[PDB]
């Protein structure tokens, strides 16, 4: 999930997809594939 200016922080599977719900683009930002 995104909060104000959080997206300037490096992507994090734990912070973004486990502690929060992440959308597909947020997941892709972690995969870097």
């Amino acid at each position: 999930a995104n909060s104000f200016l959080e997206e300037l922080r490096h992507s994090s599977l734990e912070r973004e997809c486990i502690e929060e719900i992440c959308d597909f683009e947020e997941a892709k930002e972690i995969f870097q594939n």
Binding site: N2, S3, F4, L5, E7, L8
Partner: protein, 172 residues
């Protein structure tokens, strides 16, 4: 009479990480403040002692925090969608108090490279595109601005509450 505080900010971005700011503010037709400098050292001045030392220092602090957040948002749009540099952004904003007594009219319009881009709608505190050219950049910028309390409600409150009280106090 129509009582108002206008604020203008021009931001020249040489690249994502460096910006030169140039701005000012006016109460009616009277110039009251100037802002100028690189992102690392932006000078903010009240031309006349309108606010006492402590209160001015608090206003300056809020403006410096805003500048870092504004730059941060431009850097984020670039990292996520790619922006073509150099670019110039102009923010023109303010509050206008009708003589009759109705609710203050406010605005916050953003232009990029001299053309209309996005602007704030205070009724529901939402941003809309002012350009009809669709792009990943416009869509993303609007998604971000419409996603947070900070860029919606806090921004509306700066215009409708902080700005309005400033006009009521320093013009009279």
């Amino acid at each position: 009479g129509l009582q108002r505080l206008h604020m203008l900010q021009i931001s020249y971005f040489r690249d994502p990480y460096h910006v030169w700011y140039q701005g000012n503010a006016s109460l009616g037709g009277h110039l009251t403040h100037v802002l100028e400098g690189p992102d690392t050292n932006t000078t903010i001045i009240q031309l006349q002692p309108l606010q006492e030392p402590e209160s001015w220092a608090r206003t300056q602090s809020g403006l410096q925090s805003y500048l870092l957040q504004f730059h941060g948002l431009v850097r984020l749009v670039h990292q996520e969608r790619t922006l073509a540099f150099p670019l110039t952004i102009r923010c023109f904003l303010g509050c206008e108090l009708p003589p009759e007594g109705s609710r203050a009219h406010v605005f916050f319009e953003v232009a990029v490279n001299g053309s209309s881009f996005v602007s704030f709608r205070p009724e529901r505190a939402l941003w809309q595109a002012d350009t009809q050219v669709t792009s990943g950049v416009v869509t993303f910028t609007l998604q971000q601005l419409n996603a947070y309390n900070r860029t919606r409600y806090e921004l509306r409150e700066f215009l409708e509450d902080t700005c309005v009280q400033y006009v009521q106090k320093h013009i009279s």
